[model samples]
Target chain A: IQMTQSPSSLSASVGDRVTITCRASQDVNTAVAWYQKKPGKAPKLLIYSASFLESGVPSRFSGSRSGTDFTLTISSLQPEDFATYYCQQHYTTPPTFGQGTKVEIKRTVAAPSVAIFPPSDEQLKSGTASVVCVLNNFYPREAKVQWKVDNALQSGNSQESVTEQDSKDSTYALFSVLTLSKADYEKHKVYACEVTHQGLSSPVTKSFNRGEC
Target chain B: EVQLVESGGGLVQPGGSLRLSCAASGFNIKDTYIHWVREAPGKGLEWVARIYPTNGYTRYADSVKGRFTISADTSKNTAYLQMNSLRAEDTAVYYCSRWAMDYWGQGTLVTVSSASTKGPSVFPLAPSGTAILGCLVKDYFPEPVTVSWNSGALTSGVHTSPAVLQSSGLYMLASAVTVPSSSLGTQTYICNVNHKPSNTKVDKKVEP
Candidate 1:
């Protein structure tokens, strides 16, 4: 028996609670689990077999077991926690999962737009040089921001002096500044930003040119 | 014919995550898609997602899309669902489904409680205003079981509840419905349980 999920996505706040359920073909009596994930990262296991904890999981995530019912609940959502969730069953041969529930902060307030800096053509030189990558029209929880140089992972370093913009729409805007060296950028090598949320068919990866930066 | 049997019981903290496994026997494990579903206490049914063992492709329901994952190991004919970012409401019974669930193994239960959580607690049944239903099995096999209700209404809403495992390893299930104090004298109720290997459905009511 295969399981299915509904209402694919949702918008919530940092302190909101979210719930996702999965039903079994027969009396699963128990044997359910849950998971969470962020953009560009692997899914993390939350609850197991309805309520058992996989080691190393935080206490904020918990499950409950009833006769044949299962539930995964998240109490007091967090900022960095905006992402998708899932459920599964382990008792049967072919394990199954719930489609997934996405938790995001509702953008009701608008903020100002900040300046974004991209790498320049000269930054593609062979030696280490500081290259700045900027993200525009970026809302903290709605856009998935990452920095990659030549398809290699780059760390996101936020400067304390960063500025913010307030918009009339109640959505706050911020910029991410990533610093990389010149040798890391190559011709035809791509620097990509992948963003995915409720409305995307799949994650969208956009590449920036090292020469144009 | 393939059958999936699940183990029982689980417990997790409110914010923790978990992963569980399902093992299949009796048929070609590589030929089918394994699905997972969940039912909350006293709530309607919900579909989670499915996984193809041959290539590990997975399709998740919209409701659970971002939070869950389904994966299978063809070598062992096993599939797995892992849940993350748990909360109290995340607790429920989960099942492994295949081919519309014509074949199934006894389910396992996982409870999300505090660390070292205790077993389930029994609540008092409602007063006589409700009807009680149960299933009794006279035979046992690796096939599905049947259930019968006293009321002429089809047993469509009764089969999903829990069943009792007899000493012989067979199962007997029961459910309850209420005769409104106003309609008590207007209806008759009977209880019967039967199992037919060919009939995947049990619990049917026939009008006299």
Candidate 2:
């Protein structure tokens, strides 16, 4: 059955009470599980069989169900509690996970520092042309990167992005590289990397001139 | 740091049986219960079985009841799962976990391919001035397949799409990598695919 989660995202601070709701399409009874997910890690089970706390989970976390509606509440949020919470129902086949409720620390949203690097001399000589875009020190980690060549949009040129968290401040950084054929690279005069983030009122674009590099 | 490691993942024929071993460290296997969960390719998690060695009790999910065995060895600090009458649908990544799933194994992938005919078919798309090599993998289970170029020999740019479920209950995935236009037909690329379940290595040569 499909699971719907309300308040897709919320911002709160430590010691605050947080509640995330999950509504199932059908009555799942108590065969619900709550999980906490963080970046680059396996999900941690918090509540299972609905209302029964998983052993070793923090006491502040609780689960309750009423018919098709299930709720996961954190009595007092801790610093470590700022992550995504998901609900899953095992009562049916093809168990469905909720869209997830992201809990973020209430703080000033930081825009990312964007930089674009054109292909180096050795890369150009070898006919291996690629533009690299690095975005650092961003908050929430929800950002999109786009590539533009000679004012024309380049679709599907971006490789998989690598994102990492700054452990010291919990900020995020991103690295994306756009590969192009030597013919495509030589024909384009300017390559631009555009990033759109929630913190920025407008998209941030950084450009590189092929002649300069 | 509590560590759980699972072994015994490989290719099995239809109706064949296999046993998986999960070894636990930094914690006594008897002190807590171990649960077995599996996820088929492009599917959600399914709890298969669990065992509490301390009480000598075990339970199985309705789907695998009577067909699966759950056991634990306190002396070896390991848990075991024996699956019988395996089918293609049984191919999945099996994970062992402690209560609350705070500690879990890296997961083992088991492939139940009868003919072992799963393949990564490489096809070159029409020249867009540049050569784009596309690899299509079909009928694979436990969808953690990797598509690499010449065993990581060339790393220009590769794009692998997420595995999509097919109507046949199996999965299919596609990957593409760009190469210089001049190198087309002159250069050869081995599209290497590693199926995570059976660690099956298959390669398709893209040559003109």
Candidate 3:
């Protein structure tokens, strides 16, 4: 019955104005609910319980109620609506979530800067290991590389490199590969290389240690 | 895309009754809405309740209302959370949050035992050693289950082991710790299980 959230994730732009908070476990007076996700897509429940409005959802999106606390506001902000935003508590049963708050698209002063290249300790192998994650300071064209093993997630393969730095802030590079077997290289397992750019804050994990060819 | 992915592990006993799920992808599970959270181990963050893929609206968290319940299936937006009469504090790590999960689907650990008439045992610690993770639930009882080290940080030496009952009825809780694999690696270790209709968590990552 516990629920608390704050800046678990954030990055705003567009018309600018975003707020999300939900707390309950006791007085959920008006209940509470709000949702919106747009990375791959599929998650749009606006608000309900707190301010109730789950029919069409669009006034910019609003919700306000107190007691057990509940607030979901989004006045401007839009670009297809960046992504990431959650808050829920319907009133009971087994419903709860509010550790996500992301809204991006404010990289127009010329953006692009990323560079990560860790995987040359002899290639580190057991099955398939090839790491190269670099994004070198930005301008933005296309960037997305992800791979994790001990963190329990691995499946990425991207290639398209270009970076001279400063075209007005244009730079890009991508490469991710981490596939281990042989019992995950004697279980020393610990591999990660995640990079997502559009302007980041939670997608930059880099760890490695799996050598045994 | 419409991701919801979940599948980790579960072991029950105590007053026994546990069920978990949150499988979705690409979208259209009646539109959306599936929540369930708990983060014991290092404590702070509980809200066990939510489900409504299309209909079947449900809610609970007055400390879990009376033993959780949230069902869904708008053809397969898949959502379910069940916990009944269990004890041993109900173990921890039980997540399946959506509608703003911000993309989180990698949590599942439900351990609550005490119904062993011998046979079916796996209590031999001292390998790379160090253990102490307990739970005991009866109602909303006393409310004492929060110990952590790796996944949520919050440690100050914790110990509790007293609540036995096993004729097949179930109700035996225990928590212990003595870790020392250089402090255990492979990281990921959480145990949050709180009772009263909410607060649930369970995670174990130490494969050395």
DockQ of each: 0.01, 0.09, 0.06
For A125-175, candidate 2 gives per-residue lDDT tens digits of 756465666666678778999888898988865653433344446666565
Location of the lowest summed lDDT over 10 successive residues in candidate 3 chain A:
A163-172
Q: Give the lDDT of residue B137 in candidate 2.
A: 54
Question: How well is each residue in A33-139 modelled by candidate 3, as lDDT tens digits?
Answer: 77775532345667776776666566887889778878888898766666676776746545556666765455553332333333332223323233434344454
TM-score of 3: 0.28
DockQ of 1: 0.01
Over B1-208, each residue of candidate 1 has an lDDT whose tens digit, in order, gives 5567665346567666788788898875688878776655544336678877887778887666777778878888888888776665656667676742344444545556454311111111111243332222222432234445563464432322233333434333223332344544555544444444333333333111
TM-score of 1: 0.31
lDDT of 2 by residue, B36-85 (tens): 87767645456788889998698887778888899988999999999999
| Candidates by TM-score, descending order | 2, 1, 3
TM-score of every prediction relative to native: 0.31, 0.59, 0.28
Q: Each candidate: what lDDT?
A: 0.52, 0.75, 0.53
lDDT of 1 by residue, A64-159 (tens): 866656777777776666677766665764456666776656664322222223442233243433322222233443555555557776554322
If both were scored by TM-score, which would come out higher, candidate 1 or candidate 3?
A: 1
User: Which residue pairs overlap in candidate 2's backbone?
Assistant: none
Which model is ahead, 2 or 3, in terms of lDDT? 2
Off by more than 4 A, model 3: A1-30, A33-71, A75-84, A89-101, A109-129, A139-141, A144-175, A178-213, B1-36, B39-208
